[PDB]
Amino acid sequence: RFLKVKNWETEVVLTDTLHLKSTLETGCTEYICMGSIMHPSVATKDQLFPLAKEFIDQYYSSIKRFGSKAHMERLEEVNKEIDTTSTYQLKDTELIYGAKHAWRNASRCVGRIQWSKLQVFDARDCTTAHGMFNYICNHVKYATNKGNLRSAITIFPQRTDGKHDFRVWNSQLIRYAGYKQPDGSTLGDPANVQFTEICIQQGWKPPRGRFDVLPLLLQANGNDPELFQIPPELVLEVPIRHPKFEWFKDLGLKWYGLPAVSNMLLEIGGLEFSACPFSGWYMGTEIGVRDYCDNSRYNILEEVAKKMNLDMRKTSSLWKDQALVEINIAVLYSFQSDKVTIVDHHSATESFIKHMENEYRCRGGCPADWVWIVPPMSGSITPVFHQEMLNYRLTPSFEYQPDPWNTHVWKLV
Amino acid sequence: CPRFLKVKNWETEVVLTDTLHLKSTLETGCTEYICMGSIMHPSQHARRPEDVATKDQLFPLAKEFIDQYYSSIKRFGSKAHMERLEEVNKEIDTTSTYQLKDTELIYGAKHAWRNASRCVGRIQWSKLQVFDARDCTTAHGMFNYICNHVKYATNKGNLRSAITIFPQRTDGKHDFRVWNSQLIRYAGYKQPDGSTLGDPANVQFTEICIQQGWKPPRGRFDVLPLLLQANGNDPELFQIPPELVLEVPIRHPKFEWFKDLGLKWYGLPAVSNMLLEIGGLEFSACPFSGWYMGTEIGVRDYCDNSRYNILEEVAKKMNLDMRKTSSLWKDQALVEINIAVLYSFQSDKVTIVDHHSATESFIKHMENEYRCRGGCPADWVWIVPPMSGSITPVFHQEMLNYRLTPSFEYQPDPWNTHVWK
Numbered sequence: 158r159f160l161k162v163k164n165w166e167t168e169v170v171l172t173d174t175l176h177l178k179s180t181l182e183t184g185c186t187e188y189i190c191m192g193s194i195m196h197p198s199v200a201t202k203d204q205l206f207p208l209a210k211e212f213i214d215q216y217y218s219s220i221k222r223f224g225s226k227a228h229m230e231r232l233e234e235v236n237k238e239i240d241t242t243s244t245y246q247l248k249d250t251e252l253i254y255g256a257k258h259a260w261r262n263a264s265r266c267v268g269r270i271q272w273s274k275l276q277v278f279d280a281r282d283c284t285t286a287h288g289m290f291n292y293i294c295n296h297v298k299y300a301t302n303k304g305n306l307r308s309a310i311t312i313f314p315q316r317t318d319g320k321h322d323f324r325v326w327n328s329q330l331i332r333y334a335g336y337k338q339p340d341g342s343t344l345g346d347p348a349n350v351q352f353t354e355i356c357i358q359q360g361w362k363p364p365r366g367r368f369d370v371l372p373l374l375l376q377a378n379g380n381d382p383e384l385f386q387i388p389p390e391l392v393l394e395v396p397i398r399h400p401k402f403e404w405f406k407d408l409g410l411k412w413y414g415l416p417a418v419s420n421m422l423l424e425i426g427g428l429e430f431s432a433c434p435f436s437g438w439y440m441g442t443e444i445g446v447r448d449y450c451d452n453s454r455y456n457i458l459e460e461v462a463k464k465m466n467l468d469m470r471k472t473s474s475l476w477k478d479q480a481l482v483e484i485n486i487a488v489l490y491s492f493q494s495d496k497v498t499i500v501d502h503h504s505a506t507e508s509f510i511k512h513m514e515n516e517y518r519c520r521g522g523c524p525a526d527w528v529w530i531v532p533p534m535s536g537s538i539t540p541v542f543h544q545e546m547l548n549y550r551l552t553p554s555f556e557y558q559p560d561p562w563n564t565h566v567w568k569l570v
Numbered sequence: 571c572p573r574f575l576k577v578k579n580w581e582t583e584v585v586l587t588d589t590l591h592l593k594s595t596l597e598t599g600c601t602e603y604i605c606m607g608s609i610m611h612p613s614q615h616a617r618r619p620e621d622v623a624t625k626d627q628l629f630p631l632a633k634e635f636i637d638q639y640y641s642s643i644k645r646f647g648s649k650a651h652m653e654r655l656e657e658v659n660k661e662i663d664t665t666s667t668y669q670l671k672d673t674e675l676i677y678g679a680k681h682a683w684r685n686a687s688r689c690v691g692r693i694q695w696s697k698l699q700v701f702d703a704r705d706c707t708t709a710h711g712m713f714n715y716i717c718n719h720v721k722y723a724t725n726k727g728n729l730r731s732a733i734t735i736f737p738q739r740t741d742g743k744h745d746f747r748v749w750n751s752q753l754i755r756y757a758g759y760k761q762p763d764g765s766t767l768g769d770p771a772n773v774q775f776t777e778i779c780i781q782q783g784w785k786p787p788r789g790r791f792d793v794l795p796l797l798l799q800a801n802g803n804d805p806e807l808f809q810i811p812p813e814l815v816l817e818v819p820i821r822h823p824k825f826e827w828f829k830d831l832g833l834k835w836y837g838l839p840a841v842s843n844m845l846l847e848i849g850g851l852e853f854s855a856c857p858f859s860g861w862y863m864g865t866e867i868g869v870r871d872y873c874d875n876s877r878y879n880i881l882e883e884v885a886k887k888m889n890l891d892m893r894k895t896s897s898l899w900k901d902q903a904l905v906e907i908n909i910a911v912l913y914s915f916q917s918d919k920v921t922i923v924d925h926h927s928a929t930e931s932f933i934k935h936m937e938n939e940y941r942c943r944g945g946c947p948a949d950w951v952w953i954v955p956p957m958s959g960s961i962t963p964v965f966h967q968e969m970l971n972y973r974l975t976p977s978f979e980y981q982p983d984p985w986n987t988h989v990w991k
């Protein structure tokens with residue numbers, strides 16, 4: 158089997174053979190497409206052998222040592238551990254490779270041209286929440302790099318029996334707090350209200366402001382999670398101003414420089430790393446469109462249009478669209494002026510097309526999620542809009558997992 | 571088709587439960603392992619084989635549709651339904667095809683629209699004027715029917731949705747075709763240097779027209795002649811009477827210089843290259859029209875790189891930092907252009923809907939359909955507008971895609987498959 162994808166802007170046609178090696182479901186059936194479903198729907202000894210074999214096979218294939226003496230001994234050694242301990246431990250090389258390929262396989266990530274420049278911090282020796290904090294701070298400092306951002310991941314001990322999971326309860330390492338007011342309004346980031354309430358309950362004393370960096374909520378070895386404040390000198394932040402509108406800085410807007418997803422699960426050879434925060438740098442629209450302009454988020458469109466003296470009486474004036482662009486200009490200009498790494502959605506999508514072409518050539522394809530790859534603004538004027546994409550699930554993979562507070566059974570009475 | 575599939579709106583948390591998908595009939599192109607939701611044409615799964623079907627091939631599809639239609643009018647198993655089956659059975663027994671009742675044709679056309687998972691406009695789906703052109707025998711007659719469609723649908727700017735349905739496919743050698751992709755489109759000319767004048771999408775069709783003897787005025791907005799094929803014969807050129815072609819000169823409510831770009835668009839989007847499939851019958855010529863979502867013109871027609879590509883020209887006039895992309899100069903000009911398109915259509919009282927109104931309407935339609943029908947097939951990739959997607963409600967709306975019949979289908983451009991006489 159082969160599959161063609163076509164770019165309708167360039168008429169380039171790529172041939173995906175890589176899809177033959179996927180194994181878990183898309184969620185789609187032969188007769189329904191679930192391409193727009195956000196989330197469609199611990200291993201025994203016997204479940205774990207084939208998964209581990211598959212991963213050791215492809216690692217050794219990647220490094221041109223398939224069938225080698227070292228490949229067969231590694232395969233045998235993995236089976237022993239799974240026989241002995243019902244699990245096994247990745248070598249450091251495998252762990253680095255697994256983590257880079259999970260990023261490589263992230264069909265929803267437009268920034269994968271960078272996938273092989275990933276700093277892997279092996280934190281599998283970690284045993285307590287303080288340890289996770291230290292590991293995470295070092296991650297933050299290294300990744301932030303005074304604004305010259307570097308992609309990195311810190312991998313904490315894999316799942317064992319599901320009762321001793323490591324988790325970062327934060328969804329990102331740096332996020333702003335959300336407080337719902339009695340009058341119904343929200344101060345700060347409405348997306349983080351629930352998690353803010355959990356922190357407050359765990360003892361966090363909130364500054365109750367608009368951009369309070371949340372504390373880390375860290376869970377080691379299935380124990381109750383524990384609060385830590387990131388040292389403020391490690392939280393690099395960019396105050397948002399506009400190159401044309403002097404009044405823009407008076408919105409008091411800022412964002413953090415470091416996007417650092419911490420709520421996902423890293424799966425490598427059947428091993429599950431429930432705590433694996435990873436970071437890169439922002440595409441402008443993540444902040445300028447979603448964080449700032451989703452009605453469920455900071456919802457600054459009416460404020461910005463107001464200060465632009467836009468006619469907001471009818472939608473067809475396109476005051477929202479107009480305000481959105483300026484906000485996104487400001488975000489990009491702000492970051493670039495403070496020499497904090499950021500990519501505009503045009504640059505980001507252009508590189509992804511180049512990445513996707515290269516991936517088809519050397520790897521035989523590139524699973525890609527159009528719903529996610531296409532930026533949330535100016536969709537068709539980016540090249541990815543016109544690029545057909547095949548979506549399929551390769552492993553190593555980043556996986557969603559339940560929020561820890563829906564599953565954690567609390568220890569201390 | 572599992573057991574009952576929920577879709578959630580992540581802006582409102584509204585969850586809708588889908589059972590309609592059980593009635594899905596042909597493959598989406600996806601599998602458990604690979605999703606083709608961004609493939610323009612993912613499947614080749616037809617209800618019936620390409621050529622003159624046998625009885626056991628056509629009748630089951632006919633039985634399905636007639637069953638569906640009589641069910642729709644609460645007459646399942648009734649006298650008329652059981653006669654209709656026997657009638658279709660004899661008809662197929664004798665002519666290898668069958669003819670639709672007017673009611674059935676109208677039902678079928680509206681449900682093809684209703685089932686068009688890619689159409690954001692389907693809240694209107696039952697307000698569709700159906701012109702029966704199944705008595706048409708020549709390209710001239712096709713021109714007459716089309717002009718009447720255009721005039722009725724245009725309605726002096728108060729646009730009305732319409733479909734005109736020419737005789738169905740019989741053996742495949744006697745197809746009626748509108749060779750135009752839309753009834754009204756602008757020519758595209760390849761320039762001596764290498765660039766393109768007019769609309770690059772239509773260069774090939776423009777060439778067939780010139781090659782067929784059309785005298786190109788060779789402008790940027792030359793309304794293409796109709797190229798109509800009746801009963802498999804060679805297609806014939808007809809000039810649509812310009813008084814029937816409503817056009818809007820694009821100006822801006824603030825940029826008085828915008829009028830001087832010399833841009834205009836036509837008022838009536840009228841898809842004419844698609845196939846309407848009903849109970850196994852195949853209407854290869856079925857021009858349908860409604861009215862524009864502004865972004866179709868302002869974003870795609872005007873701003874695609876392989877279309878009119880007016881961005882840099884408009885950006886220049888705006889005095890925009892065009893050195894680097896991070897200035898978002900494209901994004902900024904894009905918004906101004908779409909303000910202009912909407913402002914111009916509305917100033918001339920020509921029906922148009924912005925992408926905010928349209929998407930909000932479609933959310934409402936989805937809700938209605940889950941209420942009454944138990945589901946609504948929707949192609950998120952096509953529904954979400956090509957600009958400002960996430961500030962429209964449909965970006966945050968999960969959608970299930972599945973293929974219901976009756977339906978509109980793509981079909982090969984006739985010049986790939988037509989043997990001239």
Ligand code: HEM
Pocket residue numbers: 256260263265266267268269271275308309310421435436437438439440443500505529555
């Ligand atoms: C280097 C710069 C990077 C850029 C510019 C980038 C860009 C993006 C963007 C725009 C998204 C969509 C986010 C959203 O709209 O919510 C995304 C998703 C994602 N990225 Fe990247 N990314 C980068 C680095 C990374 C790294 C280093 C990893 C992992 C090692 C990664 C893994 C993922 C995953 C798993 C998703 C899906 C997240 C989800 O499903 O919620 N990315 N990326």
Ligand code: HEM
Pocket residue numbers: 679682683686688689690691692694698731732733858859860861862863866870923928952978
């Ligand atoms: C009445 C106002 C209507 C509006 C505002 C509307 C809106 C749209 C838009 C924006 C698209 C996507 C076009 C593109 O990006 O290429 C579309 C596609 C489509 N519409 Fe509608 N539409 C309308 C009427 C109709 C009617 C009357 C029919 C059929 C009787 C119809 C059937 C379809 C179909 C089949 C598609 C898919 C076209 C394709 O796959 O190439 N629409 N519609």
Ligand SMILES: Cc1cc(N)nc(C#CCN2CCC(F)(F)CC2)c1
Pocket residue numbers: 328329416417418419420435436437438439440443
């Ligand atoms: C490494 C990286 C770089 C970048 N620019 N974006 C992302 C992302 C994302 C998606 N994000 C949605 C919100 C969340 F659930 F909190 C975490 C997941 C990740």
Ligand SMILES: Cc1cc(N)nc(C#CCN2CCC(F)(F)CC2)c1
Pocket residue numbers: 751752839840841842843858859860861862863866
């Ligand atoms: C009835 C109607 C209303 C509306 N507003 N848009 C459409 C459309 C379309 C899709 N279009 C793509 C380009 C084409 F192939 F040339 C013709 C078909 C249809």
Ligand SMILES: C[C@H](O)[C@H](O)[C@H]1CNc2nc(N)[nH]c(=O)c2N1
Pocket residue numbers: 192193194195528529530580965966967968969
């Ligand atoms: C309903 C839809 O699946 C949902 O809104 C998706 C759309 N595409 C997205 N794309 C990105 N990059 N991030 C998102 O959160 C979403 N949300």
Ligand SMILES: C[C@H](O)[C@H](O)[C@H]1CNc2nc(N)[nH]c(=O)c2N1
Pocket residue numbers: 165542543544545546607608609610951952953
């Ligand atoms: C590759 C991709 O499917 C293609 O560019 C699609 C994307 N979504 C679209 N959506 C609409 N409404 N119209 C289109 O032509 C397209 N093109």
Ligand SMILES: [Zn+2]
Pocket residue numbers: 183185189190191192600601604605606607
């Ligand atoms: Zn799919």
